[PDB]
């Protein structure tokens, strides 16, 4: 149906950050009318749509333009192949209304070591305490999906 909630911008606040730092996004959205159910924003680590990182619920949805901060926990280096700790990965930020995904924003992420010398000379055991992630916020991929909101047809 006609789209009640719309995403307006995303700021990637703490960027670049340590691999193990939480993610902090300021999210702007506009809600045109009272809705019956919750929004769920979630953050998914993709790498490769593998692992859900965190999720925040909003209900009841405030009407109008609103800004909030979404603090999402970082991926665990333990549930990740060492191959992917110092390469390019993807995070997926998405919103659902009543369990129905209507927007999805993808970012590429560069993961690289702290200092030049360590960049040029990777140790065979990966030192996660020295990996700095850098989300490429400048170039998002935005995908929307027409969904049924509160008016059944």
């Amino acid at each position, epitope marked *: 149906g006609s789209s009640i909630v719309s995403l307006l911008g995303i*700021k*990637v*606040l*703490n*960027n*670049p*950050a*340590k691999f193990t*730092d*939480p993610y*902090e996004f*300021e999210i702007t959205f506009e809600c045109l009318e009272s809705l019956k159910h919750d929004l769920e924003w979630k953050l998914t680590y993709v790498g490769s749509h593998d692992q859900e990182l965190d999720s*925040i*619920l*909003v*209900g*009841p949805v*405030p009407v*109008g333009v*609103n*800004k*909030f*901060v979404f*603090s999402a926990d970082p991926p665990s280096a333990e549930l990740i192949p060492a191959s992917e700790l110092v390469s390019v990965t993807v995070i997926l930020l998405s919103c659902s209304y009543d369990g129905r995904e209507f927007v999805r924003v993808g970012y590429y992420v560069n993961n690289e070591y702290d200092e030049e010398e360590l960049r040029e000379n990777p140790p065979a055991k990966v030192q996660v305490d020295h990996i700095v992630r850098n989300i490429l*916020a400048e170039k998002p991929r935005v995908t929307r999906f027409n969904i049924v909101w509160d008016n059944e047809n």
Partner: antibody
Amino acid sequence: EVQLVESGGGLVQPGGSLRLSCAASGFNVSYSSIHWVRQAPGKGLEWVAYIYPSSGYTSYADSVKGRFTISADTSKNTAYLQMNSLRAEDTAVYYCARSYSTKLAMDYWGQGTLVTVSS
Amino acid sequence: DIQMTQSPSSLSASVGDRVTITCRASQSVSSAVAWYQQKPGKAPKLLIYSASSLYSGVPSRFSGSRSGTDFTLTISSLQPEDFATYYCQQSQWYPITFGQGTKVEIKR
């Protein structure tokens, strides 16, 4: 040993201007947000502004929009509050504070510097 | 457009009491609520963050809970160094917001 030191405070006329400094030591300012919070005499806590020095992204309270500017010098590990167009009701103790992996709660606080605006 | 409405404004207690300070949010907040203690002439100190996470260092008698849009600071068994002002704080929505405060005062 984490600590933040304010400086810059003092008396200034209505409509004038003052720069506050927040020198951080013991942690890397880049991997956190730095907040300014103020307290008018005998009043509650009021959030003024923040900055993520890594991105340079910032935010202001409506009461301070377009008069106050917040900035960070990542080499000096230091944050600044440039205050312009001061009104008397900007008179307060100004704390800088740091937020890190605490969903924008503030875990360390400066001693606070006092700012008086008066004719 | 968000409020942290904090109750009560003043609160009388003797040592040993279980005291409860309540903060209601004007709209939904998943977890970014924090509680602070300030003493006269001092910078506030963090007590609990993320609604219920005891900050490191803070005595375990301070705890945080949430019921719906009501966030609560509990001090089971109030000690004498606990007479202070307590502020709640929201940092999910713009703008970050402190409650009005609660002064915890000695009973007589």
